């Protein structure tokens, strides 16, 4: 029969065994080093599947060589700006949680030693700086902080300057074989919708912002930096309001009444700046990102089932009171592969309902409630939708009603297939498990005997969607009335491969013919003792409920006239 | 109506079991008076009694 075969793959085992254990492998990416030494007990650890790194983008991203200046209270406060302007910022690197701020300018003062300042607590524990740690080739400005002051109100702006035209240190030799020179010659723009550090529009510039005007500030900053001893310095040379543009792009003179009124009393003063520098550490102190592996074992047991007996007298031979053994074989078929498949399938549906919620995805191997070895490969996912054909059928011609009832179901089923595929990343899992062959998913359709005449299409590949293979199986059980069941299947494989939706552990067992007395009567008995079990691997299932179709055809299917309120009612 | 009768009666399985080999698709006899039939017969319209 088709229905049981389609969803559950047949898997035969020798009669001597009682079950099979499945070996699965996993590659893990994790921030390593449980604790910080060696001790007892088990602590608390996390591991991330590398495939889950495909979906989320923060799994394997680490910066352990970025030199962020680290505040040390009472030892380096003079090289940081006064904290009365901008409070310190908590920045997370590895495990250390420290505070940072913008380095202060100076002109006639001595330079700052960048390397000694950025000594992180993790580096504190491992010892002081070495003399062999040298800065990377690229050293560039990260952030400029300027203050526009009018009266007693101070406004702070975070004008990003990184990866601009002139923002990269360049090599030139005047003193040493290692010096780096900075020529930040450019005018920066302060747009008509840019926001302050504390968020929301600044108040001191509202006049130009309303009329769609922007201001141009010419900035000249110079700098010297040595990539061997961390000694460097930066000078602020020029900063001033330069030009004002209109919203459409012509210069407006400073002498204009509006511009002159808006810019009266404004002062722009440099405060701080941040350097982005990296440690091209050859001898290395950073520990990177560990990789791990682990294996998981899963047990599977195959039980025995009650027998089916026929009794015939042991003095007269019969072929009518005992129909030939084929009767028992047919009874065995109907008992086993008709009812148990459906019962297991619907039990899986209800269990998924109970556990996985409705339509809410789940991280990889994040739940333990279900049978599954594909549970190590794709996100668990369960979604259902009901179709009220009475309320959801477009029609303007009763001759075209059949095509429309086709199209509604087809579009909805395509939507469900797409949403499952997209949210669980199933195709990526297939491309990972198999090499050299990326198979488009094959989607099975399980329905009852009269619904296919309205869902089938010969002429479109859209029956489950383009580039999709679908096979409709029909079963007559009334538990399957008005219900659609779908899942992903690999058709060409017949082995316990964890991406199978389910495997039917089936044993060959044969009748036992003999004479036997029971409560003092004579007769021959034939016992047929089945053993078989349905197992489930894939935790993905979608349910489509079709209802109200009878009155849908029977009753008028009016065009659901959507007005939009052109009358005094909105 | 024909599909619903097929569902609730199980006629198809009966035919499949009773006759070995060929599994004839069911026939539907259509009986009416002089007036209607010219309207049941198609003049360019979707399906007749349904495929099969």
Neighbours of A268 (CB within 10 A): 16
Nearest CA in chain A to B43: A399
Technique used: cryo-EM
Q: Which of B7, B20, B26, B48 should we substitute to test contact with A (largest number of A Cβ atoms within 10 Å)?
A: B7
Q: How far apart are CA A239 and CA A267, in angstroms?
A: 10
- Chain A contacts in chain B segment 23-52 (CB below 8 A): 45-47, 50-52
Residue A486: helix, strand or coil by DSSP?
strand
Distance of CA A535 to the CA centre of its chain: 28
Distance of CA B25 to the CA centre of its chain: 9
Strand A381-388 relative to strand A540-547, pairing: parallel
Q: How far apart are CA A488 and CA A538, in angstroms?
A: 8
A355: left (phi over 0), alpha (psi -120 to 50) or beta: alpha
Q: Which of B6, B46, B51 lies nearest to residue A450, judging by beta carbons?
A: B6
And the tokens for A403? 């095509």
Residue A15: helix, strand or coil by DSSP?
coil
Q: Where are the beta strands (DSSP E) in A421-501?
A: 442-447, 469-474, 483-489
> Comparing C-alpha atoms, which of A549, A480, A388, A408 is closest to residue B4?
A549
Sign of the alpha-carbon dihedral angle for A103, A108, A114, A118: negative
Torsion angle of C-alpha atoms A414, A417, A422, A426, degrees rounded to 10: -140
Contacts of A479 in chain B (CB under 8 A): none
Give DSSP secondary structure letters for A512-537.
EEEE--SSS---EEEEE---EEEEE-
- Given resolution (angstroms): 4.1
CB A348 within 8 A of CB A486: no
Neighbours of A566 (CB within 10 A): 7
With vertex at residue A166, the alpha carbon angle to CA A163 and CA A169, rounded to the nearest 5 degrees, is 85
Angle between the N-to-C axes of helices A426-433 and A401-424, in degrees from 0 to 180, rounded to the nearest 10: 60
Does A403 lie at the interface with B, CB-CB under 8 angstroms?
yes
Helical ranges in A75-195 per DSSP H: 114-117, 121-126
| Residues 6 or more apart whose Cβ sits within 8 Å of residue A52 | A59, A363, A364
Which residue do the tokens 């989320």 mark? Answer: A56
């Amino acid at each position: 029969h088709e229905f049981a075969e389609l969803f559950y793959r047949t898997y035969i085992v020798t009669p001597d065994q009682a079950g099979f254990q499945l070996s699965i492998r996993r590659n893990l990416v994790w921030e390593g080093w449980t604790g910080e030494g060696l001790s007892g007990e088990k602590q608390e650890i996390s591991k991330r599947n590398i495939l889950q790194g495909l979906l989320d983008y923060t799994t394997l991203e680490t910066n352990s060589t970025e030199l962020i200046p680290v505040i040390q209270s009472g030892e380096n406060d003079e090289q940081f700006i006064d904290p009365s302007v901008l409070p310190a910022q908590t920045v997370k690197q590895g495990k250390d949680t420290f505070d940072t701020n913008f380095l202060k300018f100076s002109e006639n003062g001595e330079g700052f030693n960048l390397l000694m300042l950025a000594q992180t607590p993790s580096r504190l524990k491992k010892g002081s700086m070495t003399f062999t740690d040298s800065l990377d080739s690229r050293i560039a400005l990260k952030q400029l902080l300027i203050s526009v002051t009018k009266g007693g109100t101070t406004e702070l702006f975070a004008l990003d300057v990184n990866r601009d035209q002139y923002a990269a240190y360049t090599a030139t030799r005047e003193y040493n074989f290692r010096l780096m020179q900075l020529k930040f010659h450019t005018s920066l723009g302060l747009g008509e919708e840019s926001t302050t550090v504390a968020g929301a529009e600044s108040a001191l510039l509202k006049d130009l912002f309303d009329l769609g005007y922007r201001i141009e500030l010419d900035v000249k900053v110079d700098g010297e930096m040595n990539v061997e001893n961390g000694n460097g310095d930066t000078s602020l040379r020029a900063l001033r309001l330069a030009r004002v543009f209109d919203k459409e792009g012509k210069e407006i003179a400073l002498t204009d009444s509006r511009v002159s009124a808006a810019l009266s009393g404004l002062t722009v003063t440099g405060v701080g700046y941040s350097l982005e520098a990296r440690l091209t550490n050859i001898n290395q102190l950073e520990m990177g990102l560990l990789i791990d592996s682990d294996v998981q074992k899963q047990g599977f047991m195959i039980p025995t089932l009650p027998p089916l007996v026929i009794v015939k007298p042991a003095m007269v031979e019969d072929d009518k009171t005992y129909p030939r053994l084929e009767a028992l074989t047919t009874a065995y078929r109907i008992q086993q592969m008709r009812n148990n498949a459906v019962t297991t399938l619907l039990n899986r549906a209800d269990t998924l309902k109970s556990y996985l919620g409705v339509g809410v995805p789940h991280p990889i191997e994040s739940n333990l409630g279900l049978e599954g070895v594909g549970q190590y490969y794709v996100r668990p996912y369960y979604n259902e939708a009901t179709i009220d054909v009475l309320n959801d059928l477009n029609n303007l011609t009763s001759a075209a009603k059949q095509t429309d009832i086709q199209g509604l179901i087809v579009s909805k089923i395509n939507e469900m297939v797409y949403t499952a595929d997209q949210l669980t990343g199933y195709t990526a899992a297939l491309e990972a498990a198999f090499s050299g062959r990326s198979p488009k998913p094959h989607v099975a359709i399980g329905t009852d005997m009269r619904l296919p005449q309205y869902i089938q299409i010969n002429g479109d590949d859209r029956t489950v969607g383009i580039g999709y293979d679908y096979t409709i199986a029909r079963i007559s059980d009334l538990r399957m009335k008005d219900k659609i069941v779908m899942t992903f299947i690999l058709p060409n494989e017949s082995e316990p491969h964890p991406l199978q939706h389910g495997v039917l552990g089936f044993i060959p067992e044969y009748l036992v013919d003999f004479n036997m007395i029971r409560n003092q009567r004579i007769g021959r008995e034939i016992r047929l003792t089945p053993r078989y079990r349905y197992f489930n691997f894939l935790p993905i299932m979608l349910v489509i409920n079709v209802i109200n179709l009878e009155e849908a055809i029977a009753q008028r299917t009016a065009l659901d006239v959507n007005e939009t309120q052109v009358t005094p009612a909105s």
